Amino acid sequence: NADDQLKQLSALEGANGYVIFNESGIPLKRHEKSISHEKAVHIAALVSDLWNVSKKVIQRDLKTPENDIEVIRLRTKHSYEYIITQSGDFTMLAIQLCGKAIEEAKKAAAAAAAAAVVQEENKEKEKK
Amino acid sequence: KAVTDMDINELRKLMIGKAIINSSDMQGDLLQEAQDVIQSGIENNSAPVLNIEAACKYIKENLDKKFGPTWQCIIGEGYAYDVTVQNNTLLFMFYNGNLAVLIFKS
């Protein structure tokens, strides 16, 4: 059941990886494409500092009572997108790409497949 | 090609011996002796997987014999610190990649 959500996140177009953070900062589950645990430990520390600072800043720095940030989306260079949503005590980071980025990724995958096929052909030739 | 061809992953892989100095507060002659010792020591104790504790232990022992009895140096991927040190006793240099090195004399 829980495993299916990770598969569902991958299924959505423009999604690269999903990282989930506990209140302590331990990464519950991360995507296989992205680095597992080492990247999660590095991503969880940065998001907690950002989410905590933003949550604290909105309440006091903006002088607005009972105002809480719900979703933070950071758009950077190339196709990077990092939507952050907090549910209960768990906050996760999702990395999605634009249409051009997705096309580039598909092209790269195709190239990799072609390379693998070429290697297989070479192996067959060597066997012959 | 050139800078456009170069990537952050590519730059780190291309050069591992590049030395960058961010903050200098110690005398230059003293810095030259310290820089050669720290670079040689970290590579020797780097081993299969770099150990932060292993690098610091070798650096701490070498520095104490080299200059003064109480010498403190801390290396971390990222950190924020306030340190009170004697005049011309602090040198700050970070190695290529995610490696920040702080050495000071107390």
Partner: protein, 91 residues
């Protein structure tokens, strides 16, 4: 309820238990009060210097390696989230 949530844990402690308890409250107060990590290091050093006279060096980072020469029983190591509050008084 944020204070309950942080649950700061001291991996290595070399100080009196009563003094150590005081450090946990200061560490939690410093994180909420300081907008950035650099501010947190300055606040911890200033509070400890006022509370106990001496030279205090404090470094807090997501990933770091530290070897230091501190006065015995004046070094307390505590980790909250991805921040390490480390203070070592050197004479």
């Amino acid at each position: 309820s944020h204070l309950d949530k942080v649950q700061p844990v001291i991996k290595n402690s070399d100080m009196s238990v009563e003094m150590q308890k005081e450090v946990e409250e200061v560490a939690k107060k410093a994180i909420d009060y300081c907008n950035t990590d650099k501010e947190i290091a300055t606040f911890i050093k200033d509070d400890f210097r006022s509370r106990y006279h001496g030279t205090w060096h404090c470094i807090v980072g997501r990933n770091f390696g530290s070897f230091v020469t501190f006065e015995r029983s004046y070094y307390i190591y505590l980790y909250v989230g991805q921040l390490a509050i480390l203070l070592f008084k050197t004479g």
